[PDB]
Amino acid sequence: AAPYRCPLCRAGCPSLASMQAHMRGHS
């Protein structure tokens, strides 16, 4: 699958710093 495919929200991004920034909102 894509490098960082986060299902919790449904989205994939090749950058970790970007997905990590969203993890701070994953309440």
Ligand SMILES: [Zn+2]
């Ligand atoms: Zn997510």
